[PDB]
Ligand binder design. Structure first.
Ligand SMILES: C=CCn1c(S)nnc1COc1ccc(Cl)cc1
Length: 134
């Protein structure tokens, strides 16, 4: 009974494009790029009241964020950046902006057919990561 409804569930990574180039743009080092690029995460999304939780479980590094839309929070990313994040809903798309060290990256998550498509942008470099229901 909320529009974030169509994101809720357990999702498994099924394709990725350009993720190595995105990670380079972000500043991820060689060994982390290689190990992280292998990972096939499951993404678990839930909602409880105003609080959204997004968990990522993988061979590389389990993560979990909980947040309220529009309200900034601290996040330690899988690659160990300490970032300040704000997530909003813009026309049905969850828009996640991460700021650190004067840099910014945006991760958009949207439902498209039976997929959840994740677009990660750092400057001119975009990676597209497609998830299907587990
Ligand atoms: C950015 C995309 C969000 N995401 C997806 S989709 N799968 N894993 C992640 C978490 O972000 C990472 C950032 C840098 C590295 Cl090295 C590894 C993961």
């Amino acid at each position: 009974s909320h529009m974030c409804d169509a994101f809720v569930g357990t999702w498994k990574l099924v394709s990725s494009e350009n993720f190595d180039d995105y990670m380079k743009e972000v500043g991820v080092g060689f060994a982390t790029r290689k190990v992280a690029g292998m990972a096939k995460p499951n993404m678990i999304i839930s909602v409880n009241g105003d609080v959204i939780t997004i968990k990522s479980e993988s061979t590389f590094k389990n993560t979990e964020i909980s947040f309220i839309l529009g309200q900034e929070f601290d996040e330690v990313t899988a690659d160990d950046r300490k970032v300040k994040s704000t997530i909003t809903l813009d026309g049905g798309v969850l828009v996640h902006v991460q700021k650190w060290d004067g840099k910014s990256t945006t991760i958009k998550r949207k439902r498209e057919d039976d997929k959840l498509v994740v677009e990660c942008v750092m400057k001119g470099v975009t990676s597209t990561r497609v998830y299907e229901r587990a």
